[PDB]
Design a protein around this ligand. Structure first.
Ligand SMILES: N#Cc1cccc(CC(=O)N2CCC[C@H](C(N)=O)C2)n1
Ligand SMILES: [Zn+2]
Length: 139
């Protein structure tokens, strides 16, 4: 679990969005596993606007942060799950690092701010949904 809180927006994994997220929907994209909802309170986070390919992510299944080198956002095949049919997930970045079911929502940050959130993983990989191209989150 986990979310990004920036301005009057809450960014979550689309497959973990709550009834309240859907009732306050701003934007969602199944191909990216992202959903953004509106908030009444001002958020605590700021978004990176950069091309960093290294950073640190929070891994809830270890209660620890780990450093990672990750690939540039791209279209990657993701096997079927209870949440989605087998499909290509766009704007996804992969890295070697521990993740297991439950780690989705953990934040990836570089020196510039929030880069994205955990969205996939397994077998010593961890995949992050990029948010750096969503410029409207800043206004
Ligand atoms: N974190 C993590 C992790 C590690 C091992 C396994 C998993 C589960 C996983 O990959 N998916 C299930 C939920 C929806 C996902 C998607 N974006 O399509 C795919 N996550
Ligand atoms: Zn950066």
């Amino acid at each position: 679990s986990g979310a990004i809180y920036v301005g009057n927006y809450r960014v979550v994994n689309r497959h973990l969005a709550t009834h309240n997220d859907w009732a306050n929907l701003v934007w969602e994209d199944s191909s990216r596993d992202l959903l953004v909802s509106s908030t009444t309170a001002q958020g605590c986070d700021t978004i990176a606007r950069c091309d960093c390919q290294t950073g640190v992510y929070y891994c809830s299944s270890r209660r620890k942060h780990y450093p990672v080198s990750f690939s540039k956002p791209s279209l990657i095949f993701v096997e079927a799950s209870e949440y989605y049919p087998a499909r290509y997930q766009s704007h996804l970045m992969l890295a070697v690092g521990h993740s297991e079911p439950g780690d989705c929502g953990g934040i990836l940050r570089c020196q510039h701010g929030v880069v994205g959130i955990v969205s996939t993983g397994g077998n010593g990989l961890v995949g992050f949904a990029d948010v750096r191209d969503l410029l409207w989150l800043d206004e």
